[PDB]
Write a protein that binds this ligand. Structure first.
Ligand SMILES: CCCS(=O)(=O)Nc1ccc(F)c(N(C)c2ccc3ncn(C)c(=O)c3c2)c1F
Length: 267
Protein backbone atom coordinates (compact mmCIF):
# COMPACT_ATOMS: atom_id res chain seq x y z
CA UNK A 1 0.00 0.00 0.00
CA UNK A 2 2.82 2.40 0.87
CA UNK A 3 6.32 3.02 -0.53
CA UNK A 4 7.40 5.10 2.47
CA UNK A 5 10.85 3.95 3.50
CA UNK A 6 10.97 4.40 7.31
CA UNK A 7 13.76 6.27 9.14
CA UNK A 8 17.16 4.58 9.45
CA UNK A 9 16.53 1.97 6.73
CA UNK A 10 18.44 3.95 4.07
CA UNK A 11 22.19 4.61 4.31
CA UNK A 12 23.09 7.89 2.60
CA UNK A 13 26.70 7.87 1.35
CA UNK A 14 28.92 9.66 -1.19
CA UNK A 15 27.50 12.96 -2.50
CA UNK A 16 27.16 13.51 -6.25
CA UNK A 17 24.14 15.68 -7.13
CA UNK A 18 23.73 19.44 -6.75
CA UNK A 19 21.80 22.58 -7.79
CA UNK A 20 18.20 23.59 -7.06
CA UNK A 21 15.22 21.12 -6.88
CA UNK A 22 17.24 18.89 -4.48
CA UNK A 23 20.56 17.19 -3.64
CA UNK A 24 21.41 13.70 -4.95
CA UNK A 25 23.35 11.12 -2.90
CA UNK A 26 24.40 7.55 -3.62
CA UNK A 27 22.77 5.32 -1.01
CA UNK A 28 22.27 1.77 0.24
CA UNK A 29 18.78 0.32 0.65
CA UNK A 30 18.53 -3.29 -0.56
CA UNK A 31 21.68 -2.58 -2.55
CA UNK A 32 23.06 0.57 -4.15
CA UNK A 33 20.31 3.17 -4.53
CA UNK A 34 20.04 6.81 -5.54
CA UNK A 35 18.53 9.20 -3.00
CA UNK A 36 17.35 12.66 -4.06
CA UNK A 37 16.96 14.62 -0.85
CA UNK A 38 15.02 17.71 -1.88
CA UNK A 39 16.38 20.07 0.77
CA UNK A 40 13.26 21.99 1.86
CA UNK A 41 12.87 23.47 5.39
CA UNK A 42 10.78 20.93 7.42
CA UNK A 43 7.10 20.44 6.31
CA UNK A 44 4.21 20.37 7.52
CA UNK A 45 1.24 20.18 5.04
CA UNK A 46 0.23 21.19 2.42
CA UNK A 47 3.83 20.31 1.52
CA UNK A 48 3.52 16.74 2.93
CA UNK A 49 0.34 16.11 0.92
CA UNK A 50 1.96 17.87 -2.07
CA UNK A 51 5.06 15.64 -1.96
CA UNK A 52 2.94 12.49 -1.63
CA UNK A 53 0.87 13.66 -4.61
CA UNK A 54 3.99 14.06 -6.75
CA UNK A 55 5.19 10.64 -5.59
CA UNK A 56 1.87 9.17 -6.81
CA UNK A 57 2.85 10.37 -10.28
CA UNK A 58 6.10 8.34 -10.15
CA UNK A 59 4.22 5.20 -9.08
CA UNK A 60 2.37 5.21 -12.42
CA UNK A 61 5.67 4.40 -14.17
CA UNK A 62 7.04 0.89 -14.78
CA UNK A 63 9.28 0.73 -17.84
CA UNK A 64 12.84 -0.32 -18.70
CA UNK A 65 13.51 3.17 -20.10
CA UNK A 66 12.04 5.10 -17.17
CA UNK A 67 14.22 5.36 -14.04
CA UNK A 68 12.98 2.85 -11.46
CA UNK A 69 11.14 4.58 -8.63
CA UNK A 70 11.98 2.36 -5.65
CA UNK A 71 10.48 4.34 -2.75
CA UNK A 72 10.23 7.71 -1.01
CA UNK A 73 11.36 8.96 2.39
CA UNK A 74 9.54 11.47 4.61
CA UNK A 75 10.93 10.60 8.04
CA UNK A 76 14.61 11.65 8.19
CA UNK A 77 13.59 14.32 5.61
CA UNK A 78 11.76 14.46 2.27
CA UNK A 79 13.43 12.36 -0.46
CA UNK A 80 12.91 10.10 -3.50
CA UNK A 81 14.85 6.85 -3.78
CA UNK A 82 15.44 5.27 -7.17
CA UNK A 83 17.70 2.61 -8.64
CA UNK A 84 21.38 3.51 -8.97
CA UNK A 85 22.66 3.63 -12.56
CA UNK A 86 26.07 2.29 -13.47
CA UNK A 87 27.87 4.56 -15.94
CA UNK A 88 27.35 8.23 -16.83
CA UNK A 89 24.58 10.45 -18.22
CA UNK A 90 24.23 11.17 -21.95
CA UNK A 91 25.33 14.78 -21.43
CA UNK A 92 28.47 13.53 -19.68
CA UNK A 93 29.18 10.95 -22.41
CA UNK A 94 28.70 13.44 -25.26
CA UNK A 95 29.99 16.72 -23.84
CA UNK A 96 32.45 15.81 -21.06
CA UNK A 97 34.19 12.45 -21.51
CA UNK A 98 33.68 13.01 -25.27
CA UNK A 99 32.63 9.38 -25.86
CA UNK A 100 32.37 8.65 -29.58
CA UNK A 101 29.40 6.34 -30.17
CA UNK A 102 28.98 4.08 -33.19
CA UNK A 103 26.18 5.34 -35.45
CA UNK A 104 23.98 2.31 -34.67
CA UNK A 105 24.37 2.96 -30.94
CA UNK A 106 23.51 6.66 -31.36
CA UNK A 107 20.33 5.71 -33.23
CA UNK A 108 19.60 3.20 -30.45
CA UNK A 109 19.94 5.74 -27.60
CA UNK A 110 17.52 7.89 -29.62
CA UNK A 111 15.15 4.98 -30.19
CA UNK A 112 15.15 4.15 -26.47
CA UNK A 113 14.64 7.69 -25.21
CA UNK A 114 11.73 8.07 -27.66
CA UNK A 115 10.47 4.73 -26.34
CA UNK A 116 10.61 5.90 -22.71
CA UNK A 117 8.92 9.15 -23.70
CA UNK A 118 6.13 7.39 -25.60
CA UNK A 119 5.38 5.51 -22.35
CA UNK A 120 5.22 8.64 -20.15
CA UNK A 121 2.92 10.35 -22.65
CA UNK A 122 0.68 7.28 -22.67
CA UNK A 123 0.54 7.34 -18.87
CA UNK A 124 -0.39 11.06 -19.21
CA UNK A 125 2.94 12.34 -17.86
CA UNK A 126 4.63 15.36 -19.40
CA UNK A 127 8.33 15.30 -18.55
CA UNK A 128 8.71 19.11 -18.64
CA UNK A 129 12.51 18.83 -18.68
CA UNK A 130 13.94 16.40 -21.19
CA UNK A 131 17.66 17.00 -21.62
CA UNK A 132 20.75 14.82 -22.02
CA UNK A 133 21.60 15.47 -18.34
CA UNK A 134 18.42 13.58 -17.46
CA UNK A 135 19.02 10.67 -19.86
CA UNK A 136 21.16 8.13 -17.99
CA UNK A 137 23.11 5.47 -19.85
CA UNK A 138 22.91 2.42 -17.58
CA UNK A 139 25.68 -0.20 -17.95
CA UNK A 140 26.44 1.84 -21.09
CA UNK A 141 23.59 -0.05 -22.84
CA UNK A 142 20.19 0.95 -21.41
CA UNK A 143 18.56 4.39 -21.53
CA UNK A 144 16.93 5.58 -18.30
CA UNK A 145 14.93 8.83 -18.24
CA UNK A 146 14.66 10.78 -14.97
CA UNK A 147 13.90 14.11 -13.23
CA UNK A 148 10.33 14.16 -14.58
CA UNK A 149 9.01 13.93 -11.02
CA UNK A 150 7.73 16.87 -8.97
CA UNK A 151 7.25 20.06 -11.08
CA UNK A 152 4.22 20.88 -8.86
CA UNK A 153 6.81 21.16 -6.09
CA UNK A 154 8.65 23.42 -8.59
CA UNK A 155 5.57 25.71 -8.87
CA UNK A 156 3.97 25.60 -5.39
CA UNK A 157 7.30 26.38 -3.67
CA UNK A 158 9.34 28.64 -5.99
CA UNK A 159 14.18 27.94 -14.85
CA UNK A 160 17.73 28.96 -15.87
CA UNK A 161 19.63 25.93 -17.22
CA UNK A 162 17.53 23.99 -19.72
CA UNK A 163 17.33 26.89 -22.18
CA UNK A 164 18.82 24.83 -25.01
CA UNK A 165 16.08 22.18 -24.86
CA UNK A 166 13.21 24.63 -24.41
CA UNK A 167 10.84 24.94 -27.35
CA UNK A 168 9.87 28.43 -28.56
CA UNK A 169 6.49 28.53 -26.74
CA UNK A 170 8.25 27.49 -23.53
CA UNK A 171 11.25 29.88 -23.85
CA UNK A 172 9.00 32.94 -24.04
CA UNK A 173 7.17 32.52 -20.73
CA UNK A 174 3.79 33.35 -22.31
CA UNK A 175 0.47 31.62 -21.44
CA UNK A 176 0.27 30.15 -17.91
CA UNK A 177 0.86 26.51 -18.99
CA UNK A 178 3.15 26.17 -22.08
CA UNK A 179 4.07 22.54 -21.38
CA UNK A 180 2.65 19.95 -23.74
CA UNK A 181 3.43 16.62 -25.38
CA UNK A 182 4.92 18.58 -28.29
CA UNK A 183 7.04 20.63 -25.86
CA UNK A 184 8.76 17.37 -24.88
CA UNK A 185 9.19 16.49 -28.57
CA UNK A 186 11.22 19.64 -29.34
CA UNK A 187 13.36 18.79 -26.30
CA UNK A 188 13.80 15.36 -27.88
CA UNK A 189 14.76 17.09 -31.16
CA UNK A 190 17.51 18.85 -29.22
CA UNK A 191 18.85 15.61 -27.71
CA UNK A 192 18.67 14.16 -31.25
CA UNK A 193 20.79 17.08 -32.37
CA UNK A 194 23.16 16.37 -29.46
CA UNK A 195 23.46 12.74 -30.56
CA UNK A 196 23.81 13.42 -34.29
CA UNK A 197 26.29 16.29 -33.90
CA UNK A 198 27.90 15.50 -30.54
CA UNK A 199 27.38 19.18 -29.74
CA UNK A 200 25.20 21.58 -27.81
CA UNK A 201 23.30 24.00 -30.08
CA UNK A 202 24.16 27.69 -30.58
CA UNK A 203 27.80 27.29 -29.45
CA UNK A 204 28.68 30.32 -31.63
CA UNK A 205 26.51 32.76 -29.66
CA UNK A 206 28.00 33.98 -26.37
CA UNK A 207 24.92 35.86 -25.16
CA UNK A 208 22.32 33.70 -23.36
CA UNK A 209 19.57 36.34 -23.43
CA UNK A 210 19.98 36.61 -27.20
CA UNK A 211 19.42 32.85 -27.51
CA UNK A 212 16.31 33.23 -25.34
CA UNK A 213 14.90 36.13 -27.37
CA UNK A 214 15.56 34.58 -30.77
CA UNK A 215 14.57 30.96 -30.09
CA UNK A 216 11.35 32.23 -28.49
CA UNK A 217 10.59 34.45 -31.48
CA UNK A 218 11.79 31.72 -33.85
CA UNK A 219 14.58 33.75 -35.50
CA UNK A 220 17.20 31.21 -34.46
CA UNK A 221 16.97 27.41 -34.48
CA UNK A 222 19.47 24.49 -34.32
CA UNK A 223 21.89 24.19 -37.26
CA UNK A 224 20.89 20.89 -38.88
CA UNK A 225 23.78 21.00 -41.38
CA UNK A 226 26.28 20.08 -38.66
CA UNK A 227 25.11 16.45 -38.50
CA UNK A 228 28.01 14.14 -39.48
CA UNK A 229 27.97 13.10 -43.16
CA UNK A 230 27.42 9.41 -42.26
CA UNK A 231 24.03 10.36 -40.78
CA UNK A 232 20.97 8.72 -42.43
CA UNK A 233 19.32 10.97 -45.02
CA UNK A 234 15.96 10.68 -43.19
CA UNK A 235 17.29 11.31 -39.64
CA UNK A 236 17.85 14.93 -40.60
CA UNK A 237 14.15 15.24 -41.55
CA UNK A 238 12.82 13.63 -38.36
CA UNK A 239 15.00 16.01 -36.38
CA UNK A 240 13.58 18.95 -38.36
CA UNK A 241 10.05 17.63 -37.72
CA UNK A 242 10.63 17.49 -33.96
CA UNK A 243 12.10 20.99 -33.96
CA UNK A 244 9.23 22.73 -35.81
CA UNK A 245 8.70 26.29 -34.56
CA UNK A 246 4.92 25.94 -34.28
CA UNK A 247 4.03 23.22 -31.77
CA UNK A 248 1.06 22.05 -33.89
CA UNK A 249 3.49 20.91 -36.60
CA UNK A 250 5.42 18.49 -34.34
CA UNK A 251 4.98 14.69 -34.39
CA UNK A 252 3.97 12.66 -31.35
CA UNK A 253 6.17 9.83 -30.06
CA UNK A 254 4.18 6.93 -31.57
CA UNK A 255 4.94 8.51 -34.94
CA UNK A 256 8.51 9.55 -33.98
CA UNK A 257 9.21 6.04 -32.72
CA UNK A 258 8.01 4.47 -36.00
CA UNK A 259 10.41 6.66 -38.00
CA UNK A 260 13.45 5.62 -35.94
CA UNK A 261 12.67 1.89 -36.22
CA UNK A 262 12.05 2.43 -39.94
CA UNK A 263 15.45 4.08 -40.44
CA UNK A 264 16.96 1.49 -38.05
CA UNK A 265 16.23 -1.21 -40.65
CA UNK A 266 18.44 0.63 -43.17
CA UNK A 267 21.93 0.32 -41.66
C1 LIG B 1 12.15 7.80 -11.22
C2 LIG B 1 11.32 9.01 -10.81
C3 LIG B 1 11.71 10.29 -11.56
S1 LIG B 1 12.37 11.62 -10.46
O1 LIG B 1 12.13 11.30 -9.05
O2 LIG B 1 11.97 12.92 -11.01
N1 LIG B 1 14.07 11.56 -10.75
C4 LIG B 1 15.09 11.24 -9.95
C5 LIG B 1 14.89 10.81 -8.62
C6 LIG B 1 16.01 10.49 -7.83
C7 LIG B 1 17.32 10.61 -8.36
F1 LIG B 1 18.38 10.30 -7.59
C8 LIG B 1 17.52 11.04 -9.70
N2 LIG B 1 18.77 11.16 -10.23
C9 LIG B 1 19.24 12.54 -10.42
C10 LIG B 1 19.70 10.17 -10.35
C11 LIG B 1 19.30 8.81 -10.24
C12 LIG B 1 20.25 7.77 -10.36
C13 LIG B 1 21.61 8.07 -10.59
N3 LIG B 1 22.56 7.03 -10.71
C14 LIG B 1 23.81 7.32 -10.93
N4 LIG B 1 24.31 8.61 -11.06
C15 LIG B 1 25.74 8.79 -11.31
C16 LIG B 1 23.47 9.72 -10.97
O3 LIG B 1 23.87 10.88 -11.08
C17 LIG B 1 22.02 9.42 -10.71
C18 LIG B 1 21.06 10.46 -10.59
C19 LIG B 1 16.39 11.36 -10.48
F2 LIG B 1 16.55 11.77 -11.76
Amino acid sequence: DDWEIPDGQITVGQRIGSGSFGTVYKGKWHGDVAVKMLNVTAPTPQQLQAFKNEVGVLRKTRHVNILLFMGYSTKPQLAIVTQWCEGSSLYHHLHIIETKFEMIKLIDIARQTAQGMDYLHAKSIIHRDLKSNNIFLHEDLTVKIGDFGLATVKSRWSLSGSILWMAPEVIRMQDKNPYSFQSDVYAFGIVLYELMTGQLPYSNINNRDQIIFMVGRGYLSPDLSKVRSNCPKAMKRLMAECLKKKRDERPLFPQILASIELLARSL
